[PDB]
Write a protein that binds this ligand. Sequence first.
Ligand SMILES: N#Cc1ccc(N2CCC[C@@H](C(=O)Nc3nccs3)C2)nc1
Length: 167
Amino acid sequence: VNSFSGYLKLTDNVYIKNADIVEEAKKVKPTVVVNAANVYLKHGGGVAGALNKATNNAMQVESDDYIATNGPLKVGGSCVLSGHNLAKHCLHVVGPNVNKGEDIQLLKSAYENFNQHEVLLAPLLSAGIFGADPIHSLRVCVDTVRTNVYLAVFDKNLYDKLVSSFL
Ligand SMILES: N#Cc1ccc(N2CCC[C@@H](C(=O)Nc3nccs3)C2)nc1
């Protein structure tokens, strides 16, 4: 039993809700919140910009030190950093950005990072400003993630479409 509330159950391990991931994280304080990161951990917009703003830019300060030490992530890769005031940990995961021409096949590799954590609050990878089809992202999530994932979908119209079209 966990503290996530109001989710629709899609499969044995995948759950979904129309919710602002920032507000959901502040309420649940999950062990892991997933960020829709880029390889530079530059949290300018989309989910990343919103999560970072909610940390009062502390996420960005920590991320800049991480990059200065380690260099950029790989597309499809991840790193674990602090969750600040939102969660115990933040798993920064880089899905392919279609608006940069990146290989959509890397979306499965990106979701594989979730399997290293028993429970996660997450957005749909590569959705929103990353330019992928969110219906496809949900399909890859369900077919790749085996741990317990609670998906927050900001847009109510998109949420209803994701549910109604789910096979
Ligand atoms: N692509 C993409 C993408 C972009 C942003 C985003 N969020 C998550 C939910 C909260 C939202 C927020 O802070 N909205 C506000 N409106 C007025 C004042 S603050 C930001 N999610 C996905």
